[model samples]
Target chain A: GIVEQCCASVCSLYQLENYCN
Target chain B: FVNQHLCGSHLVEALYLVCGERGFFYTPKA
Candidate 1:
């Protein structure tokens, strides 16, 4: 899941945080 | 969360929140 989500993040921690970390 | 831990996780995980991202999903809360 993370592998896919990191792709989603594209290097943005803010996006990652709200994406249900 | 337990009482001693509620203040903080000297156990490990919460330390990272104030501190990285190693204990992921520990708070998968709704």
Candidate 2:
């Protein structure tokens, strides 16, 4: 479950990239 | 594993490695 939580955080980093657009 | 397999281009592959065999046992809860 930690990995998902981690990947979720990592995935959110990518989402932040969208905000940068 | 920096630059060993952490290259961004290999990220997806890294996922499979961690979430795949010989690595973390990540299973889909979905």
Candidate 3:
């Protein structure tokens, strides 16, 4: 599930940015 | 929603490879 892993990584970044903002 | 807007194309492409077709969509509901 590379796609799932990639999505998880991308979403983690997205969430981190939102949290910082 | 936001994720789709920002990364929809990447996700779609990835999904297409894994699933053998373009059949992925994402949205946030409240």
Candidate 4:
């Protein structure tokens, strides 16, 4: 899905302080 | 919609909103 794809891309690039657990 | 999702952070929400305007819906996940 688009959401999953977007998450993968964004999550990989940045260091999220609070990730979706 | 943003608040209900897993990726409900301000920065990610902003990006999601932009993606929404572009006709794509995105909700981040672990």
Candidate 5:
């Protein structure tokens, strides 16, 4: 699930970049 | 998330999430 995790991590980046931080 | 993570849907979750049989994560990161 590396791709999935990577995808999720990248997606999380957007969340952190835009919403959280 | 593809290259349209900012534009397209401009969403905080992949610009409206353009799922093309792949690439997607939400809330807790799919």
Candidate 6:
């Protein structure tokens, strides 16, 4: 699930970068 | 929880097909 985790991390970065902080 | 985490993975899989590698660097800002 490493790829999945990495993908999620990247998406989370977008959420934080754009929406949160 | 884990369900929301899994949803993010599914979201990224679709986004990759729409953005790919080069598009990611640009679209994130554009």
Leading candidate by lDDT: 3
Question: Which ranges of candidate 6 are over 4 A from the true structure?
Answer: A1-21, B1-6, B23-30
Winner on TM-score (4 vs 6) = 6
Tens digits of lDDT, candidate 1, A1-21:
232333332444432333223
The B-chain TM-score of model 6 reads 0.34
Please tell me which model should have the higher lDDT, number 3 or number 4: 3
C-alpha lDDT of residue B6 in model 4: 39
Candidate 5 C-alpha error for residue B6, in Å: 1.2
C-alpha DockQ of every model: 0.03, 0.07, 0.10, 0.08, 0.08, 0.10
User: Regarding DockQ, does 5 or 6 come out ahead?
Assistant: 6
lDDT of 4 by residue, B1-30 (tens): 232233435445655554464433345668
User: Per-residue CA lDDT of candidate 3, range B1-30, in tens?
Assistant: 233323435655544555454355445557
- List native contact recovery per candidate, as a fraction of 1: 0.00, 0.00, 0.05, 0.00, 0.00, 0.05
Q: Is candidate 4 or candidate 5 better by lDDT?
A: 4
* Residue lDDT tens for model 5, A1-21: 122332343555433243222
Recovery fraction of native interface contacts for candidate 2: 0.00
Q: What residue pairs are clashing in model 3?
A: none
Cα shift from native, residue B2, model 1 (Å): 28
Each model's number of backbone clashes?
0, 0, 0, 0, 1, 0
lDDT for B21 in candidate 3 is 44
- In model 4, pairs of residues that clash are none
Better of 2 and 5 by lDDT: 5
Instruction: Choose 1 or 3, whichever is better by TM-score.
Output: 3
Task: Report every candidate's CA lDDT.
Answer: 0.33, 0.34, 0.40, 0.39, 0.36, 0.36
